Amino acid sequence: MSKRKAPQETLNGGITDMLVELANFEKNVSQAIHKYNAYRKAASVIAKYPHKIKSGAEAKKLPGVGTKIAEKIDEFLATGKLRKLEK
């Protein structure tokens, strides 16, 4: 908790962070669950991935992800399509 100085709203991706969060549920999705394995594989290829993906097709190329959790990936970067101040 509190290592040096983390951002207030992360940078952009934060994919493996919210994917591992569902695996950390320890209640609705603790261990030996039916969908708990979905986040274990999708998070194994996402966290290895450079993270951050504007187009949803990115999670498609990621092996193990691209059927149900792929929508949750875009959910992270779904409300982060703000502009970057033009000119």
29 annotated as ligand-binding: no
The total domain count for the chain is: 1
Query: Which CATH number characterizes residue 73's domain?
Result: 1.10.150.110
Given a contact cutoff of 8 angstroms between Cβ atoms, the answer to whether 70 and 49 are in contact is no
- Domain, as residue range, for 14: 1-87
Sequence-separated (6 or more) residues with CB below 8 Å from residue 7: none
Nearest to 17 by CA among 87, 82, 75, 56: 75
Experimental method: NMR
| Residues designated catalytic | 72
* Exposed / middle / buried, residue 24 (Cβ in 10 Å: 0-12, 13-18, 19+): exposed
Known binder of ligand: residue 60? Answer: yes
